[PDB]
Design a binder for this molecule. Structure first.
Ligand code: MG
Ligand code: MG
Lengths: 862, 862
């Protein structure tokens, strides 16, 4: 067989490697057959046959039809049926298929080899209504796809029939009605084509083949190929196969199933079977009717899992007590099911760890990191609305309408659902105290929740929040302060009442799976945390330390801390401006001690003040901003106003911030370094292992870094002397300025470690203000100008080149330079993959993204 | 002579090439002597002698003193005088000097070999008061620099003498008073050193030599060397020479001069001579007293110019009818003098063009591009204040206090001086109409003037501008509207009245000099102009076309045009938003026709709209902004407010601007392209040669550029068809986004030319908001973190690498890719030099910077 390959249970001339000749689908059919799967017999016309076709004057090649006939004869003899015979009928299916995906190809044609005589022979065991309904559809399909007859001509008589009969929803058409349409359809063949419908099965087949070959050069198919610059190909193949039915009596039927439970992972066939074809009946009912069939099904499923090393979602049809395998694909499943299956298959000795790692997707794993309801279905009779999955996870708490109230609930150890028509940066404190957030995937609330791993249903516009009064209008029900409400941040649903939460998992399979993940990955995964509590949550999620502790975020923690910063900025005498810095030192030192204890034994990287001073000022009308500052700091109006204007900036993202501030106000960096080293020593004295790292933000030259490094080392010497003890530590820098990447060799002389700030790097490289990019990104994506939003998915070609240059040049200067990334791409699978192959030492992300990062760092290596 | 080289008129063992052994100064002295200059005889101790010194146990090397003695004997026999002899006295000078500049070295010591006996022998012909005053100074100097005796010990007796005598301003001290101090000074030698002042000339010399060798390892000298990582050196040399005086009678004197007039360039000795030493007398008086001397001077000057190929500023001393050449250096001169001298020296066959080009500095040339007063001195008795040279040039006009009034004066063809305590972006229209600007080098007014080439004296804080009333308080005089006032933007002066302006130059020397400049340069120099009048001013300054015409600046031209843009932004129906665009089309088309005619025969590159739409909105309180917009566009309050907020941005430099706007609102780019092509055809039909170029701003990907290019080419096809004519044109892009540089190979597929926008490129590369960088740049420069402001002087190491990468990769893709730069570095000498060697095709700057650019593009090549 050089152009036509037949195939059947345990028989096939082709093999799984011939994707070129047999096309993707052909090669798979051959493989499925080659391993003993009960697949209806058939044959495949190679892509060469399609090439010789278009080349030999775009006409049917010599000898092909001969081989095709051999194939069919082989299939007929195999199935115990013949093409165009009422007694022993043989109906076929004709599908196309290239080596790769390709649109515009001839649509699948079912039940070929059918005619008035065969249709009657079919009504025999399957029924009359089914036979002629099928004959009608075939005439339509074969006519439109093979003969190029407008479907409209056919639909013109189908609806013109109801206009006389009495219905429009086809299903009422009786047997005779169908026979009448069959006649009317054939006349369409004479009216449109001039000639009659080919009643000879062989003629149909021939045409169908030619129809497929011609589909390779179709408009859609060529545009597609022309767009992706797809060349070499050679054409499409022709996959022919036998039709089968489960309506030839009670000794037949159809069913679908997952070789394993797609929700729990339990190793048990999970599906349903329909007898003679109503509503489905479970599997156990099949064997109790078709024993030899159910047994064949079982052996088929075992084969699938043994060979494909994966759970399968299939469609089978048992015809007259004989089972048939029609469709098989890797089965979708929940994360719970994904992890259990991966682990059982390893324990079963079916797959090894390195392969199991690829069986759990980031989406699967995410599901297991947040609490979930016990039965999202059991509460269908209670759902009262649906919004957007701003942040996955299940939550149950009492309704509240203010951050302050949420915080209050939290302080009493109680669960509250914060509900606000919309949120603001001032409610952030309450949003963290709430067990769930609900507002009337891109909303600013959603983003915040995700990092915390907090449930949040945003964009639920079908809601009205009554503030004056303490109630909210949602769906048809009204909820008032104190009433229970459930939120599903994964589905976006807003159930009513107190739905149950699945209890902690005891299987240990997640722990088992993750140990493989951690064994395989080379990248370390750190966490971005600014508080002792987040440090703990990061450690519990497997973080190997803290790659980024943002000191500015340690002040927006309380009104008191914020006022303290303002006092600093408004100081009149250095005698007081130092007193204000001294005040900030305790807050810092206290927070660092807490973070260090939580990270006992792990490296902790703390970044020097980065935001422009303007950020720590009240917001609102200028007059009011001035009033608040005077009351909070003791400054007069003139000075306050002058100071506010002086701190104002046109482009704050590139203004007076980062090391520029640290360099201009040395005392600031000296205060933070003192706070760090003193906290470190205090915790060491209590037996905590502390490995502090100090990082300088927004550096663009070696000089800026050197200046800050000198300051840090000086403070370290004094603190160590004053406390009579010394501990190791490291000084490093952020690489978020494109210039820094360019002169990374020079910068590496002073920095012991590099930490890419791809957020800022992406902003400066693209010249994109993330704060304002929302005004044109949608258009860029819609227009194909951008493939992905650079802020979510690392732009490997651009930003990526700078990361590579910087990494290479920095390590050439300091061979053991530690290199990481703390931008948000640090928790994004495709970005993490790029960082791994770029040779970075680690990635650092939010606490709850840590497991995802770990998974991604392993998957890229296997 | 292997360690000590003597030298005299036409005699010297060393030569101009021995900068290593003889040090920079030694080699020069040798060269000066080697060509027959009348330089007092002397000798130089090689740097080896200094090395052997520090190495042989930091002590005087063997044989050296022997050679030193040979040298002195040679000099004595040469001069007809002996060391330590009253009758035939010989006084020496001892200077240090390495191969390169080096601070911390032993200070120059004059009149060595002096004592009580010699001092008397000196009082003989020079006088008593001079002799002992010199002896006193020598004792002091020799004691402090050679014996390490605190000057304080000496000054303690110098002021303690006046406390008894009766004066403090040394010059009254009589001969005997000096003799008394001489005695008191020597006692300081016994009190401080223990031993007496070495009265033996030979001992002094020896010590002096050792003093110099020891100066190489001095604190200051080592820190300096340690900072610049200066190695290899080997030490400093010792230059010894004979002293000479012009106070030994009427047959002696001293004088200084320029071999050519430093103000006009006239080939005539320009200087003054002082007899026996009062107030100086001109040169002609020298010959009429010392003929053989004046004749020697003449031959010396001719030699200097013949050998050094440059005008010289010197100091000479004629002692007893014998001339001596003491100091020679290239003479400072005005730009007028620089150009005339360079051109005459070529005509004289003294230097060739390639060398003359290096004789005129950018500062020199700048002086000749703007009008100047006839005699800044003649108006000294009229100056009434002094400020900052915000923008060079002389200006004479009537005082006015509003832009509107300046514009009014201009419309009547009259000269006005705009005077405002400070200026704003709204007065820009009047500032251009004024012939001069004056406000009460970094002020925003100054910068603006420079481009226009307009006179401006900013920062003249000693001024009070009375608005209510139409007068201004300056100096002691009060000026009211209409009164004449003169401004010097070069000096910063504010003369009173109507001072005369030098008439146009007729020499033709500037034209001659510039033709050499233009012959040598390879870079073409284009101009940045947005109006027909600026295009003309650029052409008159030698611009070879327009590298950048900013279309946004073509709208801030008149209230009407600005309102038209606002109407566009506030359009309610597309039926009107197009009517608003149609309105903008005429303004554009009309301006382009004008620009094209002025640039007949030269390429004109026009850039698509670049500023964020927010920029075209009124400024002020929000409520007022809304009111104005409603009145100007017909919008209601709600919509106006919504629109204003919607256009607001956090970081406008990286927001919704440039091609992002052109891509999101295609009609905008279609309107501009139509305007361009229609203007081009209209002018071609009138016989003007038009070579239009369309440039796409702020591109970061090939896709953004392709999208805009497609739009442009479509409009070009329609316009050419509608007008039945076709002309050539080009499409290109700005390279101001770091990412664009990185993917310049891809971008080059669509762009026919690259134009670097180093302003923006520098902002994104450094992450510097130029609008806000002023808050830390001063500190960075003061702290040595930055060498230069990157926005003025191209950062070759960083921004420069991106320019190189982009240029190389872009040309590899499109070999004939035209590559230029239009950022401000395009007119900065060191930046222009970098662009030339980077292989760019051209630079484009403001109109009046064009000649400077041309000069710089030539100087880098010779
Ligand atoms: Mg950052
Ligand atoms: Mg720009």
């Amino acid at each position: 067989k050089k152009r036509v390959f037949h195939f059947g249970k345990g028989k096939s001339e082709g093999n799984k490697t011939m994707k070129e000749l047999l096309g993707g689908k052909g090669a798979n059919l051959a493989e499925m057959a080659s391993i003993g799967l009960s697949v209806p017999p058939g044959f495949t016309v190679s892509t060469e046959a399609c090439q010789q076709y278009q080349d030999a004057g775009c006409a049917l090649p010599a000898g092909l039809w001969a081989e095709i006939v051999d194939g069919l004869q082989w299939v007929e003899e195999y199935m115990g049926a013949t093409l165009g015979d009422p007694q022993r009928p043989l109906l076929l299916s004709v599908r196309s298929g290239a080596a790769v995906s390709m649109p515009g190809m001839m649509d699948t044609v079912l039940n070929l080899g059918l005619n008035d005589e065969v249709a009657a022979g079919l009504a025999a065991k399957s029924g009359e209504r089914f036979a002629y309904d099928s004959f009608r559809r075939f005439l339509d399909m074969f006519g439109n796809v093979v003969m190029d007859i407008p479907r409209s001509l056919f639909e013109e008589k189908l609806e013109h029939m109801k206009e006389s009969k009495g219905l429009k929803n086809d299903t009422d058409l009786t047997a005779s009605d169908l026979k009448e349409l069959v006649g009317q359809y054939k006349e369409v063949y004479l009216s449109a084509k001039g000639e009659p419908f080919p009643s000879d099965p062989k003629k149909q087949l021939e045409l169908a083949v030619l129809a497929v070959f011609n589909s390779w050069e179709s408009p859609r198919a060529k545009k597609y190929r022309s767009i992706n610059q797809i060349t070499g190909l050679r054409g499409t193949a022709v996959n022919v196969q036998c039709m089968v039915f489960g309506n030839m009596g009670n000794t037949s039927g159809t069913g679908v199933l997952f070789t394993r439970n797609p929700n729990t992972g339990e190793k048990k066939l999970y599906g349903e079977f329909l007898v003679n074809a109503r509503t489905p009946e479970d599997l156990d009912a099949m064997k109790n009717l078709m024993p030899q069939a159910y047994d064949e099904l079982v052996e088929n499923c075992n084969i699938l899992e043994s060979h494909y090393k994966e759970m399968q979602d299939i469609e089978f049809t048992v015809q007259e007590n004989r089972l048939w395998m029609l469709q098989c694909r890797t089965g979708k499943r929940t994360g719970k099911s994904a992890v259990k299956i991966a682990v059982d298959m390893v324990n079963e000795g079916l797959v090894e760890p390195r392969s199991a790692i690829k069986m759990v997707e980031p989406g699967h794993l995410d599901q297991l990191l947040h609490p979930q309801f016990e039965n999202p279905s059991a509460y269908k009779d209670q759902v009262i609305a649906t919004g957007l999955p701003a942040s996955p996870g299940a939550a149950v708490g009492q309704v509240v309408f203010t951050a302050e109230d949420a915080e209050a609930w939290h302080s009493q150890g109680k669960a509250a659902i914060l509900v606000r028509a919309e949120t603001s940066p001032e409610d952030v404190g309450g949003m963290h105290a709430a067990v769930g957030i609900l507002t009337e995937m891109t909303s600013h609330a959603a983003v915040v929740a995700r990092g915390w791993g907090k449930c949040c249903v945003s964009g639920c516009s079908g809601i009205r929040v009554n503030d004056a009064e303490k109630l909210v209008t949602i769906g048809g029900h009204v909820l008032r302060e104190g009433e229970w409400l459930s939120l599903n941040g994964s589905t976006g649903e807003v159930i009513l009442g107190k739905q149950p939460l699945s209890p902690p998992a005891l299987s240990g399979d997640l722990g088992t799976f993750m140990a493989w993940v951690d064994d395989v990955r080379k990248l370390k995964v750190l966490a971005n945390a600014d508080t002792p509590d987040d440090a703990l949550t990061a450690r519990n999620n497997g973080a190997q330390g803290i790659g980024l502790c943002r000191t500015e975020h340690m002040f927006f923690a309380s009104d008191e801390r914020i006022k303290a910063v303002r006092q600093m900025i408004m100081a009149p005498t250095l005698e007081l401006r130092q007193q204000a810095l001294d005040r900030l030192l305790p807050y810092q030192r206290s927070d660092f001690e807490g973070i260090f204890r939580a990270m006992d034994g792990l490296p902790v990287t703390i970044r020097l003040l980065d935001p422009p001073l303007h950020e720590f000022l009240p917001e609102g009308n200028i007059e009011d901003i001035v009033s608040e500052l005077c009351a909070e700091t003791g400054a007069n109006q003139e000075d306050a106003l002058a100071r506010i204007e002086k701190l104002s900036e046109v482009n704050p993202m590139l203004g007076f911030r980062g090391c520029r501030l640290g360099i201009s106000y040395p005392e600031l960096t000296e205060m933070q370094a003192r706070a760090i080293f003193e906290a470190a020593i205090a915790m060491t004295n209590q037996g905590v292992q502390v490995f502090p790292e100090i990082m300088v933000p927004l550096v663009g030259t070696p000089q800026e870094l050197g200046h800050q490094v000198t300051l840090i080392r000086q403070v370290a010497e004094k603190v160590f002397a004053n406390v009579g003890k010394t501990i190791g530590y490291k000084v490093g820098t952020m690489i978020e300025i494109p210039r820094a990447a360019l002169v990374a060799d020079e910068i590496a002389e002073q920095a012991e470690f590099f930490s890419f700030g791809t957020n800022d790097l992406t902003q400066m490289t693209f010249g994109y203000s993330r704060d304002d990019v929302g005004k044109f990104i949608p258009v860029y994506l819609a227009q194909g100008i951008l493939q992905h939003d650079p802020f979510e998915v690392l732009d490997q070609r651009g930003v990526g080149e700078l990361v590579k240059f910087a990494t290479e040049r920095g390590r050439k200067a300091r061979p053991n330079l530690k290199v990481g990334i703390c931008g948000e791409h640090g928790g994004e699978p495709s970005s993490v993959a790029f960082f791994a192959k770029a040779g970075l030492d680690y990635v650092s992300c939010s606490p709850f993204r840590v497991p995802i990062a770990r998974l991604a760092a392993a998957q890229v290596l296997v």
